[model samples]
Target: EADVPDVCTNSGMIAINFVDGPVRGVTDRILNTLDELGVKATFSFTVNQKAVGNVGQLYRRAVEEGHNVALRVDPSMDEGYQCLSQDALENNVDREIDTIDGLSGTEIRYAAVPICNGQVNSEMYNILTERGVLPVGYTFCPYDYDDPVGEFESMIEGSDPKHHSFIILMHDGQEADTSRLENMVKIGKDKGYRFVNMDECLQGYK
Candidate 1:
């Protein structure tokens, strides 16, 4: 086996969809991509108002297929996780954690903020970490939530997540060609970068 990088390297993380709506289809494509490239990925699943049945199945599938199903505390917690009060947050977070855990029959360790909200960074981290969750950050984000169009250059010009290491974000909700996933991989490969899974990235934690 090859040695893993001690520090963040290459183009960073490639987390799957952030929304819960298109999970089934997205998971299919995401898994397909991972298989084709032989790369492992960490997914940040959101608990929108949708029933957990479908979402749960998709998550179970990911785990069964040997992929990581992490957390994305959204829907109830928004406005950078600030809209909800402290008590509300506690309930919201607990419910979300419990829901995913029950569905997958396993506890997830890693998570990503829904709005990249860092308002109560320490408190939020403590809440999740205390329950054995590890939060993650993105190396590259397009701020696509506000973009009028998904322009390629506009998103990649200075938004390069390559500072020796990074976590690139993308929505499986977006059209597969919208981000030009294949091209990005080809370019990175030519640049001599190797992709690693969440477990590999956090192997030292073991």
Candidate 2:
């Protein structure tokens, strides 16, 4: 039942924003799922101002596994995206980039805002783009945080009547989520969805 390219297609992408991880159980659960399915995903992490060790290893393992190790701003680093001086942003960005680079030789080049909040301000955009970073966008979102069911429905038909490429945002830290994480992939694949890693997505960026 493959439809015309102008019609809906299952070539849609699935993006898993692994926000909080590196805990032994948490990382193992996520990594195991990906390994089992041989699927590559993007993991957006926080460096915690160099206070946490698990976060670092999560970055290392993600890169080792051919996944995209991206940044999502460590709220503990500053005041959770409070507007600061340009110098302040640069300094924090440097620290973040440097820390990840120093540990895994993998510099984070893709970023989503903290909790997908903020306008990605002109100044911030200038800084990241000037450094050759790619800011990814979502074509389909399920609002998993607010309501899981509502979010799933969006993925099924999406909020917009018209359809295009897909990049749905979801978290892996919800303890009560039960099988929420796996459900995303299952439903997508059941509908013939195809997922690409962050690097591929970035490469497709215009």
Candidate 3:
């Protein structure tokens, strides 16, 4: 377990991750908060509005602003990698990565499992590892996409919450208050956790 770098190395550290392709209105709100906080995080691009077309501005802005633009392996699809064989899944992964890379003009080397709805078999794991793309996993799920702001705050600062490093799962498009995300950052800081981007948390392990 110690050999794996999936968790944070620094005590009380937290990494934030957002999913789905860009929704300009929602993204703008989140980006504004991120900018105000001066924090960098990871965003996994799903096959959605901005990802399929007009990805130019959002992708470029994210990379330029120091946020990671990662692939989500077809966010629109259900079952994630479970529905495909190794070859098909690999092709899907390649296409998604290539599209994002082409738009951002940077090598995209990370991905969050699409939908977080299925398991990764050995073949899928091997292919991802072989391709040098780091697969990100989360320990804390605020479920902000559906839950209230109070739940998000409570999860981060629970009286008995045990963690070394936490990767929080969140999304961009929704009716939730995006500003509440900044509140999570504040609570994390109040709990003495340093927020970091996903790559910084999972950079070296095989």
Candidate 4:
């Protein structure tokens, strides 16, 4: 029901994410922490990033551990539009979906745009739905790569409750400090917010 109060509508929820690819030991540590924390999250992998040896196994492990696996379509263009035409955009997205599906053997239902870097027009959303993938966005971003741990934690506490519910972004590749993720999750739960996977939060959208 559109009027139903869910994680987004009532109280707060957190959906964590790991963008880019999986790192050698770092990815394992993050996943382990998520398991220990009992937090489920979404992971969007770039095609090039997956080619690094052993990332496929990490992706598989993420799925096995009940994390939502998704794709991050690196735009074909740097600015203006992602593709020359709508058809091109669809094709690009389709190819991206295909590769992940074939490799991970998971029916990907969500995708995050290039981290506010790409131009997402109506056509992109249309193509996403047509291909059966939901376009997902983030609410709380720690920018954990460069930001200090204290600043990032403060940002998480502030924005997460402000939105009532949030899909928080963190990286798993070189840019991420997975240990901080544990602290953030702890803080969110301490504030009375429940951590949920992306699939559960999508249900009450109407």
Candidate 5:
């Protein structure tokens, strides 16, 4: 049982998001799985610049297939008492979305500025807000260093289409399990929840 966001009250709605993306073979394989499932997903990618051609192709496929396009900020803020200033956050976000824009050839809109914890960064939220970018978050952000397979199960366990909506945050960089993506999508279909992009999943929230 992980903490859920307040906006996750729309039952029957689900959003699957993968972070740290554009990895070598991992990211592409996940995209193929999502394609097979016929569901939209959000890949909150980082500006790795590791493979421009492949990464650009992946982002294009995600956009072309009508998935949510987003960016992620690592180490959202400084540790200890030194919180990051708005300018710093802006610089970080701009550098990222701009890089993503350059690669994807699309104007990036949403980003997940995690507080380097299992939490949100208020300052980062404010920064993205003024720039008119939507901030993405999660309802179930479980990390099983011991059991990556169990992570998706936790997401399903907390789900109930009649009572609650939730976001799934997984990774495509390290410890990403492709089978789990397929399992969650198909089972979620049988369970009667519609898996959509982040923009649609976060409906009714301002």
Candidate 6:
């Protein structure tokens, strides 16, 4: 359970996680689109609320809508960790979790180390595990922040996730090409692949 896995145990199941954000203008749109499509995503954000500039109902709606919420270690924490003492690092981890736990109104269960696809070392992984949160990782990405829309579009054009269980990488910090996401979900559903949040996606993973 402590291993960083890129796939789930269930066939034809996949997760779409929005890493490192809940931007005001952008987050609202994605939630609305998911609402329209009846899909749910896990939103990963840090303790600092400045990225979105507010916590009031910004996260509650996600909880209320049944999407999972998680924390991604702050970039500063990631880079400056070597200079920090072990106690200091552990304290920051708990602080981030506790703050988000209160705001999201749920005991956060998952976290992502910096960028999260095998980003943690053996030592860092154990710290998060000992703290009682499983750090999630993902493999499927469309490079939404740096690439064109085709980066995402061609993914749909590729083979379906029918036999593949992917932990899809996405971003809430950057706006998604809505049509691309919409059609991607539609096509996956057409082929019987179910999109889900991280909690569910990781349920049967051993």
TM-score for every candidate vs. truth? 0.71, 0.76, 0.81, 0.80, 0.80, 0.85
Whichever of 3 and 6 has more lDDT, that candidate is 6
Tens digit of lDDT per residue, candidate 3, span 1-206? 11123456544667787877577667767777888888888887774344434445787788888888877766544455556776787787677777788877788877766323333444555666677776666666665346656775666667332456777767887514665787788877777776777667665545
Ranking by lDDT: 6, 5, 4, 3, 2, 1
Colliding residue pairs in candidate 2: 142-151
Weakest lDDT window of 10 consecutive positions for candidate 1: 1-10
Q: Quantify all predictions' global Cα lDDT against the true fold.
A: 0.57, 0.59, 0.67, 0.68, 0.69, 0.73
In candidate 5, where is summed lDDT lowest over 10 consecutive residues? 1-10
Comparing 2 and 3 by lDDT, which wins?
3
Candidate 6: clashing pairs of residues = none
How many residue pairs collide in each prediction?
A: 5, 1, 0, 0, 0, 0
Runs off by more than 4 Å, candidate 5: 1-9, 48-50, 74-86, 116-119, 142-159, 174-177
Q: How well is each residue in 9-45 modelled by candidate 6, as lDDT tens digits?
A: 6667768888777676677778889888988778887
Q: Give the runs in model 4 whose Cα sits over 4 Å from its true position.
A: 1-10, 48-50, 75-78, 115-119, 144-163, 174-176
lDDT of 2 by residue, 1-206 (tens): 11101112234555555654445457657867777777787776666555364555666777888778777655553343446767887788767666766665687777665323324445556666677665555544455347765567555655332334456555556523436666667766666655557766545344
Q: Which of 2 and 5 is ahead in TM-score?
A: 5
> Candidate 4 has what TM-score?
0.80
Better of 3 and 6 by TM-score: 6
TM-score winner between 5 and 6, please give it. Answer: 6
List runs of model 3 lying over 4 Å from the truth.
1-6, 48-55, 80-82, 114-119, 144-148, 158-163
Residue 156 CA displacement from its true place in model 6, Å: 5.1
RMSD for each of the candidates: 6.4, 6.4, 3.8, 4.6, 3.8, 2.9
Model 4 agreement with the true structure over 1-206: per-residue lDDT tens digits? 01111234344677776776667777778888889888888788776444666666776787888988888775444353443776766676788888887776789887766435323455566777778886676655665446655775665556556457766777776445666676777788877677877776565554
In candidate 5, residue 201 scores what lDDT?
78
Tens-digit lDDT string for candidate 1 (1-206): 11212334334433332333335565577667766876555667765456444555776766776667776776545555445677778778888888777666678877665433322356677777778886665545544546523443344443434554434565666634433565555544544455555665565553
